[PDB]
Amino acid sequence: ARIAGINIPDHKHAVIALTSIYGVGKTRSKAILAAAGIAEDVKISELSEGQIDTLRDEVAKFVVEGDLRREISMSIKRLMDLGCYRGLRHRRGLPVRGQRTKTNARTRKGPRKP
Amino acid sequence: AKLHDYYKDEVVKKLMTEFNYNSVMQVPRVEKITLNMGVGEAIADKKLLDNAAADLAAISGQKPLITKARKSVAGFKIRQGYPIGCKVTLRGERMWEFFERLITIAVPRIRDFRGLSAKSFDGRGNYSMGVREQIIFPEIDYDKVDRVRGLDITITTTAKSDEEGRALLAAFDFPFRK
Amino acid sequence: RSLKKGPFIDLHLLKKVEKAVESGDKKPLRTWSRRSTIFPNMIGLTIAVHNGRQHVPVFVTDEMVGHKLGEFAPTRTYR
RNA sequence: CCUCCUAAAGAGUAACGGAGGAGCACGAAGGUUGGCUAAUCCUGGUCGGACAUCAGGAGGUUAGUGCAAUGGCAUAAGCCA
RNA sequence: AGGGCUACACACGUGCUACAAUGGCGCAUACAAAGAGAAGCGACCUCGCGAGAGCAAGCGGACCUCAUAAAGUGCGUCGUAGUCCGGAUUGGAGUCUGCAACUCGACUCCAUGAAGUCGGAAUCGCUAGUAAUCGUGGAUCAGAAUGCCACGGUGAAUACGU
Ligand SMILES: [Mg+2]
Ligand SMILES: [Mg+2]
Ligand SMILES: [Mg+2]
Ligand SMILES: [Mg+2]
Ligand SMILES: [Mg+2]
Numbered sequence: 001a002r003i004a005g006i007n008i009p010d011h012k013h014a015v016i017a018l019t020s021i022y023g024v025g026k027t028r029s030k031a032i033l034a035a036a037g038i039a040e041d042v043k044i045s046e047l048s049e050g051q052i053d054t055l056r057d058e059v060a061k062f063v064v065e066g067d068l069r070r071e072i073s074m075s076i077k078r079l080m081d082l083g084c085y086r087g088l089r090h091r092r093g094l095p096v097r098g099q100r101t102k103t104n105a106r107t108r109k110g111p112r113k114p
Numbered sequence: 115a116k117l118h119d120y121y122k123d124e125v126v127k128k129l130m131t132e133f134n135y136n137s138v139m140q141v142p143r144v145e146k147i148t149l150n151m152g153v154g155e156a157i158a159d160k161k162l163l164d165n166a167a168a169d170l171a172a173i174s175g176q177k178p179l180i181t182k183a184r185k186s187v188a189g190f191k192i193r194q195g196y197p198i199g200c201k202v203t204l205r206g207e208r209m210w211e212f213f214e215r216l217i218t219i220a221v222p223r224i225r226d227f228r229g230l231s232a233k234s235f236d237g238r239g240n241y242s243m244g245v246r247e248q249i250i251f252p253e254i255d256y257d258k259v260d261r262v263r264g265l266d267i268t269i270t271t272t273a274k275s276d277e278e279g280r281a282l283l284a285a286f287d288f289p290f291r292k
Numbered sequence: 293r294s295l296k297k298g299p300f301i302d303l304h305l306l307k308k309v310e311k312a313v314e315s316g317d318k319k320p321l322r323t324w325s326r327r328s329t330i331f332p333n334m335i336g337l338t339i340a341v342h343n344g345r346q347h348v349p350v351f352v353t354d355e356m357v358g359h360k361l362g363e364f365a366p367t368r369t370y371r
Numbered sequence: 372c373c374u375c376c377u378a379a380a381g382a383g384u385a386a387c388g389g390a391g392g393a394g395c396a397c398g399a400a401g402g403u404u405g406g407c408u409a410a411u412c413c414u415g416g417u418c419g420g421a422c423a424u425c426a427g428g429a430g431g432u433u434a435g436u437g438c439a440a441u442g443g444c445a446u447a448a449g450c451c452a
Numbered sequence: 453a454g455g456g457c458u459a460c461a462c463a464c465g466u467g468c469u470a471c472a473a474u475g476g477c478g479c480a481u482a483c484a485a486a487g488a489g490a491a492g493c494g495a496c497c498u499c500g501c502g503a504g505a506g507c508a509a510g511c512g513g514a515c516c517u518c519a520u521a522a523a524g525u526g527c528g529u530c531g532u533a534g535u536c537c538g539g540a541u542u543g544g545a546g547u548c549u550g551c552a553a554c555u556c557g558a559c560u561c562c563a564u565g566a567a568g569u570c571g572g573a574a575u576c577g578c579u580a581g582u583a584a585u586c587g588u589g590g591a592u593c594a595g596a597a598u599g600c601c602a603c604g605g606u607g608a609a610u611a612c613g614u
Binding site: 041068071072085090094097098099102107113 | 458
């Protein structure tokens with residue numbers, strides 16, 4: 001089921017499947033179950049109607065999918081358009097966590113640019 | 115004629131006093147929705163067009179009108195034929211009925227909608243805005259659908275000015291943003 | 293920015309910036325306390341932050357507060 | 372061999388005068404019946420931006436014409452079935 | 453005083469962690485050595501998701517503290533998937549050390565979840581409690597160890613021959 005949108009995890013346990021929802025990890029997923037009244041081993045797919053209904057209803061609290069990936073980029077901009085070292089880093093494809101650039105950074109900049 | 119009736123009834127008179135028109139046979143009416151969904155690309159795939167077709171035929175209650183190429187000298191390329199989309203205007207009944215599935219189940223079936231544009235107007239007074247992305251509304255298997263979509267929509271009212279174009283639509287349930 | 297509880301800043305900028313609050317905006321503020329957090333009192337004020345070379349025309353802004361006057365003045369010259 | 376100028380407002384006229392094309396192409400690109408009308412710009416529209424398709428306005432043979440040029444073409448000689 | 457030595461389009465050496473099922477994850481749970489400590493180690497209980505904070509005992513130390521070893525063993529789950537693999541990156545919010553955490557600290561929480569599917573030519577160490585693998589302590593030190601020095605658990609293969 002859409003649950004939060006598109007994402008339709010099946011077979012996998014409710015917990016490990018719920019995580020598929022863009023914006024939740026082992027924590028948010030493991031809690032949403034009990035909080036809603038669902039086991040862990042329970043297969044989201046095999047689950048009965050209500051056993052999937054509450055999910056959506058409760059996951060509506062925390063932000064997910066779009067909104068997240070959406071506003072998440074806004075926060076990145078807020079500082080970029082600001083002009084602080086942080087933002088400045090992004091508009092330069094350089095690490096903000098204060099790492100070393102002279103070496104190791106392929107994840108930030110990318111593969112060699114010889 | 116669901117919304118249609120509402121027009122003559124609620125609307126019209128509303129404008130007849132807000133615009134003080136002399137004759138009822140003047141009050142701007144709803145002059146067919148147009149739609150389009152310019153498939154563009156096509157060229158290589160071509161299938162994304164037929165898909166866009168049904169994907170369009172789904173929305174509109176009629177049959178998609180696959181267009182061609184006017185210039186045939188597109189900057190990109192494109193030849194004389196080279197299909198690029200499918201307008202598919204609306205017909206009175208289906209038109210207003212569509213004006214229903216829309217504004218009530220289209221814009222409402224948002225994606226992140228928090229207000230509709232108010233400048234989609236024109237000169238003579240005709241609004242036309244592109245959904246930017248097919249809201250996946252009542253389409254063949256909402257989830258089991260074709261890759262994205264996105265299309266345009268033009269109302270083209272019989273108004274003489276965008277100003278008056280505001281009354282219309284707004285006289286209905288046009289989401290807008292104020 | 294981790295400072296647990298208590299937005300820290302240098303006494304210098306404080307006594308100086310406060311004067312700006314009343315006297316109103318005017319000339320910049322030659323300061324080296326780039327490690328001091330920006331406050332809403334200096335909001336949109338004419339300040340100046342060092343960076344090894346010299347000072348830079350730093351002006352406070354709305355959201356530009358919980359930050360340090362330094363994270364707005366780049367130091368190292370790069371191409 | 373074809374088109375324009377030279378050619379002096381009928382035809383026609385020269386040069387190692389100035390310019391450019393033909394040696395084909397279509398069973399439809401022919402016949403007919405029925406229907407249609409551009410180019411270009413302005414405004415507004417998902418991805419569409421200089422220009423893909425959609426909408427409205429201005430505009431009016433500035434489009435189009437299988438291939439040169441001249442002449443012609445809207446009752447279309449242009450376009451679709 | 454502030455900045456720089458932490459610059460980054462690159463290349464080379466030394467390492468850490470991965471590419472998973474001889475594994476991951478949950479719960480239960482067994483065995484060790486060697487060391488450190490009054491401007492320190494700091495329990496107990498209280499609060500906190502956690503880092504950590506409050507109160508405050510004990511120990512200058514085979515008394516107390518750092519300190520409830522990991523692999524492992526049982527059960528269960530996963531099902532060979534770029535996958536409950538792997539964690540880089542980054543975003544939001546915090547703890548603490550010190551005047552002072554922008555430049556440039558360590559760590560915690562939620563979220564994000566890249567490359568990576570065992571690596572060319574070439575090349576390194578190791579002959580036994582060794583290699584491999586798994587944890588533990590210390591020096592320096594307010595606070596920045598995958599480095600260095602050191603400790604113990606488990607525990608191989610192969611050696612005709614020059
Ligand atoms: Mg003559
Ligand atoms: Mg004559
Ligand atoms: Mg150095
Ligand atoms: Mg110590
Ligand atoms: Mg230490």
